[PDB]
Amino acid sequence: ALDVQCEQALQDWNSRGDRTVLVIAHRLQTVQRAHQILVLQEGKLQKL
Amino acid sequence: EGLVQFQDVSFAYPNRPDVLVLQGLTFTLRPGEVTALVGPNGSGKSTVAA
C-alpha cells in the first residue's frame, strides 16, 4: 500500500552492509536487485 | 441506472474541518464504463470512496 515514488525510494537502502534483510514480495517486483532469490510454492522451496 | 455525479464536491473531516481533503471534485460515473482514480498516498481517494 505504497505509491510508486515511495516504493522506488525505499528500494535497497535498507541494507547497510551489516544488516540482514528479508524482503517478502508477492511477485518479482522491485526485488531483482537482491543478492539472493528464494521462490516458495505450496510450502516447498524451489531452486533457481 | 447507476449514474453518479460529483459536482464541485469538497470535504473536510469533522475532527479536523479546517483542512480540506477534497477540493472541487467534478466528474461522472456512467454505466458500462470504468473510471480509474489514481494518485499518490494521502490524495483523498479512499475519502472519495467513503
Ligand SMILES: Nc1ncnc2c1ncn2[C@@H]1O[C@H](COP(=O)(O)OP(=O)(O)OP(=O)(O)O)[C@@H](O)[C@H]1O
Ligand atoms: N478518519 C480520519 N480523520 C482524519 N483524517 C483522516 C481520516 N482518514 C484519513 N484521513 C486523512 O485524509 C487524507 C486522505 O486519506 P485517504 O485515505 O482518503 O487517502 P488515499 O489517497 O486514499 O490514501 P492511500 O493512497 O494511502 O490509500 C490523509 O491525509 C489522511 O491522513
Ligand SMILES: [Mg+2]
Ligand atoms: Mg486509501
